[PDB]
RNA sequence: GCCGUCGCUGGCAGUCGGCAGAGCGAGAAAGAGAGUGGCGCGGACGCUACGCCGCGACGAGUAGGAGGGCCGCUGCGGUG
RNA sequence: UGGAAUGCGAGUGCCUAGUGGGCCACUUUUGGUAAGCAGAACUGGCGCUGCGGGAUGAACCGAACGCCGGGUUAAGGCGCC
RNA sequence: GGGCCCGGGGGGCCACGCGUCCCCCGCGAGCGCACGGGGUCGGCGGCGAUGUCGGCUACCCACCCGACCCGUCUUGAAACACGGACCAAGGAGUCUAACACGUGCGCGAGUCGGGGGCUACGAAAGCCGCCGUGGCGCAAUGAAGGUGAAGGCCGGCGGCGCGCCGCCGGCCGAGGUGGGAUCCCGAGGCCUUCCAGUCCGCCGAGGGCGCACCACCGGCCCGUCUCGCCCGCCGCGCCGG
RNA sequence: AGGGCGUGAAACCGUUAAGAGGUAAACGGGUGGGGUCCGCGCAGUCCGCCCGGAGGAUUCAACCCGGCGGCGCGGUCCGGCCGUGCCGGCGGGGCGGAUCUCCCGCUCCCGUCGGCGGGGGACCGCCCCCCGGCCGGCGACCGGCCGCCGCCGGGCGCAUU
RNA sequence: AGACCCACUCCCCGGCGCCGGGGGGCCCAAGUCCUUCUGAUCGAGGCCCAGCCCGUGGACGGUGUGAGGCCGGUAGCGGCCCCCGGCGCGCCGGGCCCGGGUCUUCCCGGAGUCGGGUUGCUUGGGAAUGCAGCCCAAAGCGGGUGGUAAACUCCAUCUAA
């Protein structure tokens, strides 16, 4: 959970185009669907419009 | 993780509650192997009683 | 890892099916179709797959390669094998068995191989 | 009815509080119109700056907040004339006046009256006529350089003066913080009453000594 | 506490274990070389830790360092060391109970009168 | 959500949970905390105790404000102040304290709970507790009185 | 015999394969230890570990509590 | 020589619904001529509970209940029903 | 009768190498049968294309045994207690606020931007940090004025008379007892031709550090009561400690 | 879908068909009989190995060429990225600090001297980037060569395979 | 107001003329291509490398299903045409003859109101928060407030009717 490798940017013919970009660490980040699946939960319904009768 | 947001006034990324995650490459080595019992894998089913005498 | 990859998908994924009581994964480089760790095609760096040949001759053996792991494109290598009934497996068993890939896929990617070549015969 | 151990509760729900519920769904339509309504005010009033006229330094009243300055209503009168500045004129060139307030102090009065110096060092003025330039209006050179200042101007600050180390003192050692508070509470509780004791000792003694 | 109870004789060079959260005090001045492990530990306690020599330990890390748990110290944080523990036991308004009552407020006007002194009807 | 709660487990159950017998009914006992000194008595001298009757003078317009005094104990001291701080003058050799201003960190009154290091400091508050006075006096520091 | 529950807070990561060697149920602690001197290319299933397997006991229920529903209805985000 | 027998894993803390009309039997027992009456003690029951017997029956006798096969019983029975 | 049924002078023994000293007088090979860790046959027969074979349950009918109509209040309902002729659709623990405890997630002596501001879905989301004002927490206690959370030892001095108080300077230092998961040490020991002694592990009487938690005993902070001797000074006080 | 016409339920009714009928009907358990249909039944499974008879080949192994792949403690091959490692840098910098300190604006006082605010600099902590040495990974992160092995394509093998 | 120094010509009203957001109207991409299903289709399949065509337009609606390309629209710092408004620039007839500082001398305030008693209502406002009726009824270094009634005494802060 330390290697951060080198990525390739590819140019718009879809191929490297030499340049290359270390890995942000964010992508190293742990992954936690709970986490996630608990904000996306309680975000989604900040959008909503009320309704009554 | 060295290095704190510099767009964030302040932040930094989730630590990691468990640096290895290869379960499978962790319960392989010499380490853990060497302090485990050995496996009892024999299955010991019900024995039908038969009368002694 | 294929460890916590596994805890993602193990009841979230576009490929379990979830019917009659059965559970199935729809994904490639899956020899059982089984929704099982072991079984999975995505989360192992290495996994076995057997297809049958886009035409109806043989069976298509695919590994994947060891190092890009990152890199859909060439990250998995095909082999089309189109020989007689025993030499295909001979060539599936020896593929595993001597390089030890996935020695515990053997007889599962065996047995697909069969059930590939047996459906490619003349239906009576 | 209560129900074991709990909280005794006295909710102020007894009157039609459903009748007088002010919902909050038209907020953000509240902030796009006071966001559209600076924007045009600024656009309107530019290059002055937008946040609108300069205030002035003041400390908070009461002893929770006297260590803290922020922003006041207008400059003082007194203010104003140490700086020679006309009352009148001052806001037609983006200076707040507040007739009410007083200077009890004179530190607080020159740190408005420098205020306001230092404001006039900055403020462009344009002539009235920009084909007749005028005595007191700022130089053609530095007026295509003028733009419209966001955020508050000269923003206020609370700064505190950095003490270094220094060897503690013999006197600054005996000196005896805690009984030195209380015996000033003391004498501060006693005073009316002691020369209250005074007083009449002094008249007592008189009528014996006449 | 770590601190206190690692310096205890005989507990040098021993791995502290804690399932939980280490939090940092600010009222400690010097902090020792410690060698933890811990499922978390806050920020700030992870460079006091770290800059004097420490070590921190996840627990799958601690499992390769110490199989069967060898040469540590488990360590628990207080558990009663919550607000909720003050109003348990007997209520607040029998003999001999220091219980914390349940009040919206806390002041002079606030179930003070009957019950906690003799003055109003009685104490107990 | 509702979907997780009793109400749809009591489907198909007479009385919903609320009993054949009591029933549930509207307001047995009183709304809120009627019967304090009546049939709710044991509840109230149980739970509450003080909470009938009147004691103490009354203050007309309290301020609040008039009564600020945040306090901190000693073992907090030198937290206001940087880390920096702290470590140089433990190591300097002139003997120079340096000054921790608690009402500049927000605070009028120093207290007595916890050890100071052995370090001189001078401190400076509206008010000191006897006990802080002498702590910080023991390691060589000065108390000074701000208004 | 079969179903479920509870218990053993039971067993299985050892699928350690030709870089091989198949055991750890057995009355009675602790090593199928390490060393130093005196032809064939083969070997079922398994393991959604929230999984799989074994053994033993048990099973009435109003009011009431709890768990589990690959029970069912309507709409939203994803996916098929 | 864990200092009688026997049996059994225990301790502890939070939150908590319903209930707060009961009624019946052996024994003991108050009032009353007595009551399928009113009021108590003990245990056990019915209420909440089916099942075999008492022809029938809230409580009696036996016995307590997952869905089944075989065997044997309890209390009760074996002219015919 | 009991003494491996003491010792001497036809019938069963889970006796059967031997060198010895002497009480007493560590591996043979095979093969086969089974009352042996829960059933198999390496045993058979008949019938079958237009009237016959199989189909639990389901449709109708018959018979034997069983069987009173539900919901409800009730000690007790099949009740000569009440509602219910029948069918469809509708029909009853919700939402807001407060509080309590439990659980899950984030951060952690902090935490929270909720109000405000900046920058189709989007009224979303993102950001603010000299926007953390403010709430809750980090300190209690008293009606209030107010006060507001460990000490011990060494050396020296003043007073009273080896002991006590006060003042100086140096050392150590957040309590103890009982129980206590876990951890640590290790008397001895874990075998294979026999001895010596190693490297890794492994069990273990006894002995230690003792988490959390509990019981108990001390300490410290605030109110109040009793007793009493001192110490301070820009105010010598109905002062302060 | 025939003008209150999409679909067209139940209760209730007409007719047709089958069954039945003196303890109102209905109901649980166990069978039996009869129908409605279903098996789209009616000489009854499939699979592996081996023996034998008949045939037929995009014919087997082994070797040669080429591609791809796995692994290598290659006991210590080269090159790379790279260490949420450790060391020496006159290293070229960003952030932070309640650690210290030559320039200016305003201001009190005689043309001077002192105070507020405004900036360098030094120092410390951390981070980024450059350079040198050790140990290190390449299993969230690989190339070239060499070796072994596997697979595939093409040759050659032409038949007791 | 006066004296003394100092500084001043653009500020507005009514008319007249010229130059750079709002309402309305009209328009602006691309398949009805080849097979085929259907009562009819907007469906299915196809449209060389490449990938039918447009796409700043794949919102929606209509049309014999189900349509980015059939029609309206949608997109666009797209276009054209009217009307209104806003903002500048000149000419004419008018008004104003406008200020700052320092001294000298002068002037300065709201009454049946305040305030007080009592009553009633009202407020968190408690020996009376506010309001109102009736009675009494002001002062001028005064008056009001200073959250416990009152006398004396300092202060603070405003200036009611
Ligand atoms: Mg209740
Ligand atoms: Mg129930
Ligand atoms: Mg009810
Ligand atoms: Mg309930
Ligand atoms: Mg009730
Ligand atoms: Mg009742
Ligand atoms: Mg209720
Ligand atoms: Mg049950
Ligand atoms: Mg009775
Ligand atoms: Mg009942
Ligand atoms: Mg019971
Ligand atoms: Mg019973
Ligand atoms: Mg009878
Ligand atoms: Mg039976
Ligand atoms: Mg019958
Ligand atoms: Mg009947
Ligand atoms: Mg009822
Ligand atoms: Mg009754
Ligand atoms: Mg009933
Ligand atoms: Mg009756
Ligand atoms: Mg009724
Ligand atoms: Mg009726
Ligand atoms: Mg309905
Ligand atoms: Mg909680
Ligand atoms: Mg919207
Ligand atoms: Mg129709
Ligand atoms: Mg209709
Ligand atoms: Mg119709
Ligand atoms: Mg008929
Ligand atoms: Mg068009
Ligand atoms: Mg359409
Ligand atoms: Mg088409
Ligand atoms: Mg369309
Ligand atoms: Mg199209
Ligand atoms: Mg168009
Ligand atoms: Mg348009
Ligand atoms: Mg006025
Ligand atoms: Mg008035
Ligand atoms: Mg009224
Ligand atoms: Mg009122
Ligand atoms: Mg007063």
Not at chain 5, 2 to 15: A, F, V
Request: proline share 6%; glycine share 6%.
């Amino acid at each position: 959970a330390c290697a951060r490798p080198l990525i390739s940017v590819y140019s718009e013919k879809g191929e490297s185009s030499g340049k290359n970009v270390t890995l942000p660490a964010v992508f190293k980040a742990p992954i936690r669907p709970d986490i996630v699946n608990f904000v996306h939960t309680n975000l989604r319904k900040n959008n909503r419009q009320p309704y009554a009768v | 993780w060295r290095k704190a947001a510099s767009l964030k006034s302040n932040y930094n990324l989730p630590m990691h509650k468990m640096l290895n995650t290869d379960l499978s490459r962790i319960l392989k080595s010499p380490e853990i192997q060497r302090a485990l019992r050995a496996p009892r894998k024999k299955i010991h089913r019900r024995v039908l009683k038969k009368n002694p005498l | 890892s294929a460890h916590l990859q596994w805890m993602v998908v193990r009841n979230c994924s576009s490929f379990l099916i979830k019917r009659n009581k059965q559970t199935y994964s729809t994904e490639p480089n899956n020899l059982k179709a089984r929704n099982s760790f072991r079984y999975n095609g995505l989360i192992h760096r290495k996994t076995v797959g057997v297809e049958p040949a886009a035409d109806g001759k043989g069976v298509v053996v695919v590994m994947k390669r060891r190092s890009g792991q990152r890199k859909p494109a060439t990250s998995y290598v095909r082999t089309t094998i189109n020989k007689n009934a025993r030499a295909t497996l001979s060539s599936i068993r020896h593929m595993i068995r001597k390089n030890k890939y996935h020695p515990d896929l053997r007889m599962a990617a065996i047995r697909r191989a069969s059930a590939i070549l047996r459906s490619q015969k003349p239906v009576m | 009815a209560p129900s074991r151990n709990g909280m005794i509760l006295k909710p102020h729900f007894h009157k039609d509080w459903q009748r007088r519920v002010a919902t909050w769904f038209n907020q953000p339509a509240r902030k796009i119109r006071r966001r559209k309504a600076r924007q045009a005010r600024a656009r309107r009033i530019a290059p002055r700056p937008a946040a609108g006229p300069i205030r002035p330094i003041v400390r908070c009243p009461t002893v929770r907040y006297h260590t803290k300055v922020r922003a006041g209503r207008g400059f003082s009168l007194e203010e104003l004339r140490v700086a020679g500045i006309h009352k009148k004129v001052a806001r037609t060139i983006g200076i707040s006046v507040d007739p009410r307030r007083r200077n009890k102090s004179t530190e607080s009065l020159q740190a408005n009256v420098q205020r306001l110096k230092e404001y006039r060092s900055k403020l462009v003025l344009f002539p009235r006529k920009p084909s007749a330039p005028k005595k007191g209006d700022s130089s053609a050179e530095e007026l295509k350089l003028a733009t419209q200042l966001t955020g508050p101007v000269m923003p206020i600050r609370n700064v505190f003066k950095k003490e270094k180390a220094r060897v503690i003192t013999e006197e600054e050692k005996n000196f005896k913080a805690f009984a030195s508070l209380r015996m000033a509470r003391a004498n501060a509780r006693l005073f009316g009453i002691r020369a209250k004791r005074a007083k009449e000792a002094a008249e007592q003694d008189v009528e014996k000594k006449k | 506490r770590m601190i206190r109870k690692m310096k205890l004789p005989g507990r040098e060079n021993k791995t502290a274990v804690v399932v939980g959260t280490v939090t940092d005090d600010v009222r400690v001045q010097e902090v020792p070389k410690l060698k933890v492990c811990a499922l978390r530990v806050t920020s700030r306690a992870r460079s006091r830790i770290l800059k004097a020599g420490g070590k921190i330990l996840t627990f799958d890390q601690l499992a390769l360092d110490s199989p069967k748990g060898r040469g540590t110290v488990l360590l628990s944080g207080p558990r009663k060391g919550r607000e909720v523990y003050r109003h348990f036991g007997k209520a607040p308004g029998t003999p001999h109970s220091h219980t914390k009552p349940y009040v919206r407020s806390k002041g002079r006007k606030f179930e003070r009168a009957r019950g906690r002194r003799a003055s109003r009807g009685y104490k107990n | 959500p509702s979907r997780l709660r009793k109400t749809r487990k009591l489907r198909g159950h007479v009385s919903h949970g609320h009993g054949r017998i009591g029933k549930h009914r509207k307001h047995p006992g009183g709304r809120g905390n009627a019967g304090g000194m009546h049939h709710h008595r044991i509840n109230f001298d149980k739970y509450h105790p003080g909470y009938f009757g009147k004691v103490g003078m009354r203050h007309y317009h309290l301020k609040r404000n008039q009564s600020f005094c945040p306090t901190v104990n000693l073992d907090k001291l030198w937290t206001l102040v940087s880390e920096q701080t702290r470590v140089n003058a433990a190591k300097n050799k002139t003997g120079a304290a340096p000054i921790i201003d608690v009402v500049r960190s927000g605070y009028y009154k120093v207290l007595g709970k916890g050890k100071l290091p052995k370090q001189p400091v001078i401190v400076k508050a509206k008010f000191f507790s006897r006990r802080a006075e002498e702590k910080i006096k023991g390691v060589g520091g000065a108390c000074v009185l701000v208004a």
